[PDB]
């Protein structure tokens, strides 16, 4: 798949807002995911002990990871499709070390859309959301193809 320049502009426009508060967004997203799909929290050995949302919100550790994760995704999105180099080290760690099924990548894509929709209604209408979805699908499709070559295809 290929996104048009107009679709990238919509994605990058909302992303500029996300960058005014990387840590706040990273936090909201992770928490959202963990709430609506508790199983995913099991993948994090440093977070499993987090019982309530108040526990998550207060966790300085979940916040730094939300920043590290959003920054890697931001780096990928700005490549506007030309992200193969960035995708490699990433695919290898999630398939081989952390073992994250594609399904979990879908779930987080969902959390991302939910959060942007809450915090940025004005820059996230139907078209902006279509663009963001097409972008994350692209990302997932490439990660999946990559998982396969590394012998996981989880």
Query: Which residues would be at the binding site for ligand HEM (CB under 6 A)?
Result: 40, 43-44, 46, 65, 68-69, 72-73, 90, 93-94, 98, 100, 104-105, 108
Q: Which residue has the tokens 């995704």?
A: 73
Instruction: Give min distance, CB of 34 to ligand HEM, in A.
Output: 9
Closest CB to ligand HEM among residues 18, 122: 18
82 marked as part of a ligand binding site = no
Calculate ∠ Cα 64-32-65, nearest 5°: 15
Q: Provide, rounded to whole angstroms, the least separation between the CB of residue 1 and ligand HEM.
A: 17
CB of 101 to ligand HEM, least distance (A): 8
**Least separation in angstroms between CB 82 and ligand HEM:** 16
114 annotated as ligand-binding? no
- CB closer to ligand HEM, 91 vs 122: 91
Give me 77's structure tokens: 């999105």
Query: In the complex with ligand HEM, which residue's Cβ is closer, 27 or 122?
Result: 27
Q: Find the angle CA(37)-CA(77)-CA(42) to the nearest 5 degrees.
A: 20
Annotated binding site: 65, 94
Annotated binding site for O2: 65
């Amino acid at each position: 798949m290929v996104l048009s320049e107009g679709e990238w502009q919509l994605v990058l426009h909302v992303w500029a807002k996300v960058e005014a508060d990387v840590a706040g967004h990273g936090q909201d997203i992770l928490i959202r995911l963990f709430k609506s799909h508790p199983e995913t929290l099991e993948k994090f050995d440093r977070f499993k002990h987090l019982k309530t949302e108040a526990e998550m919100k207060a966790s300085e550790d979940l916040k730094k990871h939300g920043v590290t994760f959003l920054t890697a995704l931001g780096a990928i999105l700005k490549k506007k499709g030309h992200h193969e180099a960035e995708l490699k080290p990433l695919a290898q760690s999630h398939a081989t070390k952390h073992k994250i099924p594609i399904k979990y990548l879908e779930f987080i894509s969902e959390a991302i859309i939910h959060v942007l929709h809450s915090r940025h209604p004005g820059n996230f209408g139907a078209d902006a959301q279509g663009a963001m979805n097409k972008a994350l699908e692209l990302f997932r499709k490439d990660i999946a193809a990559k998982y396969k070559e590394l012998g996981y295809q989880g």
